[PDB]
């Protein structure tokens, strides 16, 4: 009840915080991935949706 601790010296500390801000931007060609070079698939793909 009658005792306290008071700091008699100081230390300056530098600490690193790393935060992600951005992610890789990607574009996907639907026709190329699903149907490759096949024209017939592309025509079928149009019907799908």
């Amino acid at each position: 009840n009658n005792s306290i601790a008071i700091p008699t010296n100081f230390t300056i500390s530098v600490t690193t915080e790393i935060l992600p801000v951005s992610m890789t931007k990607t574009s996907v060609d639907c026709t190329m991935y699903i149907c490759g070079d096949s024209t017939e698939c592309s025509n079928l793909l149009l019907q799908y949706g």
């Binding site: 574009s27 060609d29 190329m32 490759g36 070079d37």
Partner: protein, 98 residues
């Protein structure tokens, strides 16, 4: 009983061969394998039993030409997205293409 497109084929249909063209985007029918691609000479090598070479996606990336027996790299014909940079139609109808 026959197996399809996994080995060199000694039995073929009546289709007539055409002279190969390199460095151009072309439709190809190499021993029944059909694709559209640019065909280039390959600095790589193949074993005798290995007629066809596939990539990670399981799509052929190299083929051994029938007759000539020289391996040809298959590269997809150039493709890219098109984006139109446009000032508002009210301002102008002129457009830029990326």
């Amino acid at each position: 009983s026959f197996e399809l497109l996994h080995a060199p084929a000694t039995v073929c249909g009546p289709k007539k061969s055409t002279n190969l063209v390199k460095n151009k985007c072309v439709n190809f029918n190499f021993n029944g394998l059909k694709g559209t691609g640019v065909l280039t000479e390959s600095n790589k090598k193949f074993l005798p039993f290995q007629q066809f070479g596939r990539d990670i996606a399981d799509t052929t990336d190299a083929v051994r030409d029938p007759q000539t027996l020289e391996i040809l790299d298959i590269t997809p014909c150039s493709f890219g997205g098109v984006s139109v940079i446009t000032p508002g139609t009210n301002t102008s109808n002129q457009v830029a293409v990326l």
